């Protein structure tokens, strides 16, 4: 209700890079905010693909960021009379971007990898890999959880049981507030999905460079399965944390597989040790129910809801015809050792195409009224199909099915204006929470600041 | 605090057989590759060969194919050496062995096994 | 199979001084290489990794350096328990093959 659309900030980045792709708010050990960007085809060094990330720091003006380093050479091990391989060309680094404390884990979910031993291989595959800064003491470190050193043969002979090579790891991300990263590989188990759990600082103590294959104790990877539901469901394709069972000193997971059972999708909210707690279930077969999941308490009772997006859902219409305009769905929790029942309210795009629920951002309390509100974006909707993000004021009853605001793309035709959303976060010290918009198309970030 | 436990020392016959054990403490023996390594006074340290006790596989250096069986069992959290065929030359400490991080390297130790071969 | 050749075999030093264990692969081995420690009866401890990476809680006196087929452990200042045998172990190739040894001995 109280984003300033006129004052806004805007991040620019090169052109072609999809600056924007993903972002985050990023806090230093001084308490100063910054905006972590993610552009996932930067070219390198030697004008090859390979992404980049840039820390934004606040100011009214905006304009250019620097660049977050990382190490974009190519990696060959001799070891164990096997030779690992990294390949970083086309990797997509800051495909996405997330923030902990005094870290930043920008991942590319593209990196390949292979192990070459004599006339086998293990098959030169997009494992995925995660790149892990520490900006105010320079500290890097690196994250692989799929990469492998089994050949080719060996998962033929096992059925492609246990088969991480294609995760994608990375693809999405999340941090808990302990400081275990969670990524999304829906690649894995042979494009079942899967996620990887890992403390960031075991993450950080456990790496070396050139080491390529090397154990993280405490990590915690899920389940592969012969279930054929499961079969190429994308499940890890979104994440998100939340509290779900009643128990503080326990954390859920909310896993996204938006073509879970025959392209029906769903969305599963899971404890530590990844066994179900409850599965929603997607409304129509190729949707993409769960290509976003957002968790926050909109109705101020303090339980957090779950908020699933189905950005290709099709709204019935006058004689029998289909019009593709997005679905978000608000799952109220209730009280108790209850299940999630059906949606408290369903919210659905107007502009065909639009691609309504494709990104799902919690803003706080953007109006200090109690209840937390959030932004739902559709990345090619409004009247021109440029963009709009539509923000929902939360209430006793859940949230509204009016809009309190609706902010237009201010950047041409094809930049995916919402495709990223980020807020929660107090960027210029004035008491309300910000929000800040990428549109990877248009290589910008758009900072809008919440008013009194 | 991560440690391996080995089984105590052994006055074995020669032509027969021993098993050794080693058994993973404040760990999973399947975590990582676990080899096992043999030492002898004159001799000095040789690497016998290694397992996965996720999967089973293993690896030997030839000089102990046919005589050395490694094998592990993540129930018992345990993995064993077992020696056939025992000779004079078969009397050494043997030692399970894991890396830290780095998954090929030989960091972790056990206390050792003695195994004497005598009539 | 790659033979490790390590030297001395034997140095007799004192507390205080700085030592260089050599080890020198028959072929490249791309700091592919441990080094490992045997107190008087007692068992192994692992003390570099890849060539140069300390294993957890080794003293910061122990270093190692080189490359391609040639390596040394460096000890800076002997403390007394640091008498005792290294060893060095290469995993470039299976089968893994380890150093001849060399005693640290008490100089008198």
């Known amino acids: 209700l109280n984003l300033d659309p006129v004052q806004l900030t805007f991040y620019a980045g090169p052109n072609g890079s999809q600056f924007g792709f993903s972002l985050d708010f990023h806090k230093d050990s001084h308490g100063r905010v910054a905006i972590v960007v993610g552009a996932p085809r930067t070219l390198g060094p030697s004008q090859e693909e390979t992404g980049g990330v840039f820390l934004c720091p606040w100011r009214a003006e905006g304009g250019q960021c620097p660049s977050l380093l990382f190490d974009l050479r190519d990696e060959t091990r001799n070891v164990g009379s096997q030779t690992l391989q990294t390949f970083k060309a086309r990797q997509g680094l800051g495909a996405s971007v997330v923030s902990w404390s005094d870290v930043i884990v920008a991942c590319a979910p593209w990196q390949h990898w292979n192990v070459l031993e004599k006339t086998e291989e293990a098959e030169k595959t997009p494992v995925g890999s995660c790149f892990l800064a520490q900006p105010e003491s320079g500290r890097r470190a690196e994250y692989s959880p799929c990469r492998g050193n089994t050949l080719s043969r060996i998962y033929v002979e096992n059925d492609f049981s246990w088969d991480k090579r294609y995760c994608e790891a990375g693809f999405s991300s999340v941090v808990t507030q302990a400081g275990e990263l969670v990524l999304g590989a829906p690649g894995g188990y042979y494009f079942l999905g899967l996620l990887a759990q890992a403390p960031v600082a075991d993450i950080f103590s456990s790496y070396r460079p050139g080491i390529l294959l090397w154990h993280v104790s405490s990590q915690s990877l899920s389940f592969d399965s012969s279930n054929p539901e499961y079969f190429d469901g994308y499940w890890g394709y979104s994440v998100a944390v939340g509290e779900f069972d009643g128990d503080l000193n326990t954390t859920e997971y909310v896993v996204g597989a938006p073509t879970w059972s025959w392209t029906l999708g769903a969305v599963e909210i899971l404890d530590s040790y990844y066994q179900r707690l409850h599965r929603l279930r997607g409304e129509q077969m190729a949707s993409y129910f769960g290509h976003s999941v957002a968790v926050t308490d909109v109705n101020g009772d303090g339980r957090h809801d779950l908020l699933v997006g189905a950005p290709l859902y099709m709204e019935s219409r006058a004689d029998r015809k289909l019009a593709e305009v997005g679905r978000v769905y608000l799952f109220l929790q209730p009280r108790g050792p209850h299940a999630l029942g059906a949606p408290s309210l369903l919210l659905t795009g107007t502009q065909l195409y639009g691609r309504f629920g494709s990104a799902i951002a919690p803003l706080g309390d953007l109006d200090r009224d109690g209840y937390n509100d959030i932004a739902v974006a559709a990345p090619y909707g409004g009247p021109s199909g440029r963009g709009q993000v539509l923000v929902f004021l939360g209430q006793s009853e859940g949230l509204r099915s009016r809009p309190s605001q609706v902010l237009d793309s201010p950047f041409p035709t094809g930049s995916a204006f919402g495709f990223s959303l980020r807020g929660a976060v107090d960027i210029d010290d004035n008491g309300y929470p910000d929000l800040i918009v990428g549109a990877y198309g248009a290589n910008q970030v758009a900072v809008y600041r919440a008013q009194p | 605090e991560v440690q391996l436990q080995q089984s105590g020392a052994e006055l074995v016959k020669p032509g027969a057989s021993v098993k050794l054990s080693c058994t993973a403490s404040?760990?999973?023996?399947?975590?990582?590759?676990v080899h096992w390594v043999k030492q002898r006074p004159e001799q000095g340290l040789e690497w016998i060969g290694r397992?996965?006790?996720?999967?089973?596989?293993?690896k030997y250096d030839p000089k102990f194919q046919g005589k050395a069986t490694i094998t592990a069992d993540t129930s018992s959290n345990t993995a064993y050496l077992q020696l056939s065929s025992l000779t004079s030359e078969d009397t050494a400490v043997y030692y399970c062995?894991?890396?830290?991080?780095?998954?090929?390297?030989?960091?972790?130790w056990g206390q050792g096994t003695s195994v004497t071969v005598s009539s | 199979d790659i033979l490790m050749t390590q030297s001395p075999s034997s140095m007799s030093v004192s507390l205080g001084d700085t030592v260089s264990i050599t080890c020198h692969a028959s072929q490249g081995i791309s700091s592919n290489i441990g080094w490992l420690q045997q107190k008087p009866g007692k068992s192994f401890m692992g003390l570099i990794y890849?060539?140069?990476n300390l294993v957890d809680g080794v003293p910061s006196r122990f270093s190692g350096s080189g490359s391609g087929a040639d390596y040394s452990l460096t000890i800076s200042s002997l403390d007394s328990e640091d008498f005792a045998d290294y060893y060095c172990?290469?995993?470039?190739?299976?089968?893994?093959?380890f150093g001849g040894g060399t005693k640290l001995e008490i100089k008198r």
């Open positions: 062995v894991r890396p830290l991080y780095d998954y090929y390297a030989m960091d972790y």
């Open positions: 890849y060539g140069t």
């Open positions: 404040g760990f999973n023996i399947k975590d990582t590759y």
């Open positions: 397992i996965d006790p996720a999967n089973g596989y293993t």
């Open positions: 172990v290469q995993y470039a190739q299976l089968p893994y093959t």
